[PDB]
A paper describes a structure:
Energy-coupling factor (ECF)-type transporters mediate the import of micronutrients, such as folate, cobalamin and pantothenate, in the majority of prokaryotes. A tripartite ATP-hydrolysing motor (ECF module), composed of a membrane-embedded scaffold protein (EcfT) and two cytosolic nucleotide-binding proteins or ATPase subunits (often hetero-dimeric - EcfA and EcfA’), forms a functional core complex with a membrane-embedded substrate-translocating protein (S-component). Structural and biophysical analyses of ECF transporter complexes from three different organisms, with different substrate specificities, and from different laboratories revealed that the core complex and minimal functional unit exists in a 1:1:1:1 subunit stoichiometry. Based on these fragmented structural insights, a model for the transport mechanism has been proposed in which a substrate-free solitary S-component with an outward-facing binding site topples within the membrane upon substrate acquisition, associates with the ECF module, and exposes the binding site to the cytosol, thereby moving the substrate across the membrane.
We then obtained a cryo-EM reconstruction of the nucleotide-free solitary ECF module in lipid nanodiscs at 3.8 Å resolution that shows a vacant docking site for the S-component. The ATPase dimer adopts an open conformation, and the structure of the module is very similar to the conformation observed in full ECF transporter complexes presented above (rmsd: 1.8 Å), as well as to the ECF modules of previously determined structures of the folate-, pantothenate- and cobalamin-specific ECF transporters from L. delbrueckii (rmsd: 1.6–1.8 Å). The main difference is that transmembrane helix 3 and the regions close to the extracellular side of the EcfT subunit in the solitary ECF module are less well resolved. We attribute this to a higher degree of flexibility caused by the absence of any stabilising effect typically exerted by a bound S-component. Notably, in the solitary ECF module, the docking site for the S-component remained structurally intact and unaltered compared to the docking site in the ECF-FolT2 complex. Yet, in contrast to the full complex, it is accessible to the lipid nanodisc environment. Moreover, the docking site is hydrophobic, and, therefore, compatible to interact with the surrounding environment of the lipid nanodisc. In the ATPase open conformation, the lipid nanodisc has a dramatically increased thickness around the empty docking site. The observed thickness of ~50 Å in this area is needed to avoid the exposure of the hydrophobic docking site to the aqueous environment. Moreover, the imposed tension by the convex shape of the coupling helices in the closed conformation may not be energetically favourable and was captured due to the mutations introduced. Thus, the solitary ECF module in the open conformation likely represents an energetically more favourable post-ATP-hydrolysis and relaxed state.
Numbering used by the authors:
A (entry chain B): 2 to 12, 21 to 282
B (entry chain C): 9 to 265
C (entry chain A): 1 to 14, 18 to 281
Write the structure that this text describes.
């Protein structure tokens, strides 16, 4: 249960955060460009320790005076996947690069290899491509390996910066499906995307932030109930939501606000019936 | 760096750089009490003309005190003698060397002092094209200067981006589980060097993409260009010139001959 | 007529498999033609192939005849003048110290007098919409804004073809619409052909022509309302049909049929309203 009390980072600026994210649910952290998402990014595993308040994360405690000793346990419990992972590839062998994750948390060689193979299989890639150099991977494939290195050691909380930045829609859909399947196992994903349609499709808790402060924290069905609020706070809208607004501007009634594609289809089917 | 309204920020950066070079040659040239005081008063007059706070120069000078004090002590003890206050078990504790010792000290100080203003009055791009203008007479050689100026201007803005990419990959690797800073120098040979290659290849890819874009926008060499950003000599640009000339007089009427 | 023609061409990078093979197509004059397909196998190389950066492996069978000037090692720079490109990554393409210097880079390279350079760069920056950032440093600019400046650099030179090589891939789905609207308005005003090589099919949904690339070979060419209904082909190739056609498919599975002439939100709201009325 992630818990932030009076959390504020100074010297991008973050001030006076107060919230509680539960376990076993999707979390989407939406915010304006450079409005505090990147600063709240690194506090989830004490890359940048807070200058006030308290953070509670899976039984671990984070306070401004905590040192760098013993943070490996926290970084095991909570993992980060930074944006444009194609530049963080490290080892000479793809298998070695993926197993480099578990090798820093006491995992034995056999179990590290087994986890690496299992997670490459889950991300798919190819079975015969696990031995070539990571630099030889072709474009989007280079992404698919990197996430494995973050997802190898089954972190309890995984926090994702934009993973689908620059991927074809089929690849983005497959990646989001994989993340949702991982979340279904009992873990939590904290996904950050400007792309609002992904947030509308796959989320349960939405954390709307701007100007380095927290404003809204509620289910996606509630954050999109007032288009004037979204326009005022410079936050986009789901594509299905814009279609529903355009359709309602034509004088056609919709039974409830839909967010995803099947919801809009069912709503208009009910309306015509 | 620090902006302001003082007249120094109005004059041509090329004139600033030429005056700085002339001043450094004079400070390397003056070698007696009277000329040393001449250069000192000229430098302090220049500082007061800039109108900046003394702390702005003091804090900049602070990191560079080790080399100047070490050189001053080394050259003082190399020739000192004469009066002695106390005698230690080995060192004689000579005192007459100061007759030039601190002198050399203040020399380097003035050097840094001038360098200080040179890095606070103009943004780096201005210094870059001033360097290009100063090296323009090098065109008699086969090597051209326009391409060098362009690549310097490019690098002066990519370098912060490169460092940001380096700190980003540092944060990513730390989040993965790696340990870099508190592992000691023995663990640095297994932490930073194998990480070095991907950032280098990323920088090479960035340079290649920039070269491709520049060549696709019509970069037919660097000889037929017509510069957009230009700096012209103003009438106020005369005040550092005559100043310089005055020092020349006050350098030729008091030289040791 | 026909502006840019590539026919009987095939390229191998420097090399285990031909990326482009037997590609043959044409571009209409003053029309929005967009190339779509799976990543690699042609999309990433067409832009650098059109203006003679890359070269066909066999120059004997070359047929690049952009604007009637058959491309070759002798006459590359004429094509460079006649074709502009907006590249994918915006950060590592913003050459020059600041705005009003990046935008005037082409004019600086063309050896034109300075006052005319100032006039043209000011007018182009005003046209794009970066008037308030006429002297901002690139660091202050945030993402999509940079791309706008790049378009200005293409617009100042007065080109005849603008090639967007996945120019909207690294942007949020909001600024992408802004850049698309800007490009459409520029195309309407200056009367210049636009070729948009993008994987995102929102651009292709509004294009006049769309070309599908399978493995380096053209597979189908036509209007978006003529090809996108063939959803099985796009699914097998590895592409997902756009918003309006995906919605039409969902209603088709939901039990209600719609005409295939519908192409966007307009006339689709009309069809639904008429269906409810009728």
């Amino acid at each position: 249960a992630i818990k932030f009390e009076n959390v504020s980072y100074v010297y991008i600026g973050l001030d006076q955060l107060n919230f509680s994210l539960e376990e076993g649910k999707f979390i989407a952290l939406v915010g304006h460009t450079g409005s505090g998402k990147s600063t709240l990014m690194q506090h989830f595993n004490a890359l940048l320790k807070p200058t006030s308040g308290k953070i509670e994360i899976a039984g671990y405690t984070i306070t401004p005076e905590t040192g760098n000793k013993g943070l490996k346990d926290l970084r095991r419990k909570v993992s980060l996947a930074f944006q444009f992972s194609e530049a963080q590839l490290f080892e000479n062998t793809v298998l070695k690069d993926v197993e480099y994750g578990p090798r820093n948390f006491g995992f034995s060689e056999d179990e590290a290899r087994e986890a690496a193979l299992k997670w490459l299989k889950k991300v798919g890639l190819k079975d015969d491509l696990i031995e070539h150099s990571p630099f030889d991977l072709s474009g989007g494939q280079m992404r698919r390996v990197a996430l494995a290195g973050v997802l190898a050691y089954e972190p309890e909380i995984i926090c994702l910066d934009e993973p689908a930045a620059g991927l074809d829609p089929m690849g983005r859909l497959e990646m989001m499906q994989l993340f949702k399947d991982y979340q279904a196992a009992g873990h939590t994903v904290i996904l950050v995307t400007h792309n609002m349609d992904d947030v509308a499709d796959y989320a349960d808790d939405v954390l709307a932030l701007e100007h380095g402060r927290l404003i809204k924290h509620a289910s996606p069905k509630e954050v999109f109930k007032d288009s004037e609020w979204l326009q005022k706070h410079h936050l986009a809208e789901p594509r299905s939501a814009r279609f529903a607004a355009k359709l309602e501007a034509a004088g056609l009634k919709l039974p409830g606000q839909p967010l995803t594609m099947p919801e809009l289809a069912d709503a208009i089917k009910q309306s015509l019936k | 760096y620090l902006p302001g309204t003082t007249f120094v920020y109005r004059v041509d950066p090329r004139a600033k750089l030429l005056t700085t070079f002339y001043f450094i040659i004079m400070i390397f040239l003056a070698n007696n009490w009277v000329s040393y005081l001449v250069i000192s008063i000229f430098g302090l007059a220049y500082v007061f003309a800039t109108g900046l706070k003394a702390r702005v120069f003091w804090d900049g000078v602070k990191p560079m005190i080790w080399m100047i004090v070490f050189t001053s002590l080394l050259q003082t003890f190399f020739m000192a003698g004469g009066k002695v206050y106390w005698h230690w078990w080995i060192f004689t504790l000579s005192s007459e060397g100061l007759i030039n010792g601190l002198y050399v000290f203040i020399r380097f100080a003035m050097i840094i002092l001038v360098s200080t203003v040179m890095t606070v009055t103009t943004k780096p791009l201005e210094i870059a094209d001033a360097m290009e203008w100063m090296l323009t007479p090098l065109k008699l050689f086969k090597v051209n200067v326009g391409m060098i100026s362009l690549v310097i201007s490019i690098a002066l803005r990519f370098v912060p981006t490169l460092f940001d990419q380096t700190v980003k990959i540092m944060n990513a690797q730390r989040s993965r589980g790696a340990d870099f800073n508190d592992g000691g120098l023995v663990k640095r040979a297994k932490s930073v060097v194998p990480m070095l290659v991907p950032l280098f290849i990323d920088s090479l890819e960035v340079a290649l993409d920039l070269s491709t874009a520049m060549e696709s926008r019509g970069y037919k060499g660097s000889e037929g260009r017509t510069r957009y950003r230009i700096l012209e000599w103003s009438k106020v640009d005369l005040i550092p010139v005559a100043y310089c000339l005055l020092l020349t007089i006050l350098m030729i009427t008091t030289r040791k001959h | 007529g026909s502006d840019n023609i590539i026919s009987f061409d095939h390229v191998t990078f420097t090399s285990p498999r031909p990326a482009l093979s037997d590609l043959s197509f044409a571009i209409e004059r003053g029309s929005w033609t967009a190339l779509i397909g799976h990543n690699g196998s042609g999309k990433s190389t067409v832009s650098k192939l059109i203006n003679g950066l890359l070269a066909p492996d066999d120059l004997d069978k070359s047929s690049i005849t952009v604007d009637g000037v058959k491309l070759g090692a002798d006459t590359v720079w004429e094509v460079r003048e006649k074709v502009g490109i907006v590249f994918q990554n915006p950060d590592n393409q913003f050459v020059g110290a600041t705005v009003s210097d990046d935008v005037a880079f082409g004019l600086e390279n063309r050896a034109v007098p300075r006052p005319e350079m100032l006039k043209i760069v000011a007018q182009a920056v005003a046209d794009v919409g970066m008037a308030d950032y006429a002297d901002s440093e690139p660091s202050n600019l945030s993402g999509g804004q940079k791309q706008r400046v790049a378009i200005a650099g293409i617009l100042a030179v007065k080109p005849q073809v603008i090639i967007l090589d996945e120019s909207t891939s690294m942007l949020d789905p909001e600024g992408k619409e802004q850049i698309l609207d800007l490009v459409r308005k520029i195309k309407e005003d200056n009367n210049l052909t636009v070729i948009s090589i993008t994987h995102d099919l929102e651009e292709a949904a509004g294009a006049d022509q769309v070309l599908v690339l399978d493995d380096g070979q053209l597979l189908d060419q036509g209007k978006p309302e003529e090809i996108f209904p063939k959803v099985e082909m796009l699914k097998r190739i590895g592409l997902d049909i756009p918003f309006v056609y995906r919605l039409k498919q969902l209603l088709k599975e939901r039990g209600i049929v719609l005409p295939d002439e519908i192409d966007d939100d307009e006339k689709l709201v009309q069809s639904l309203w008429q269906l409810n009325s009728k």
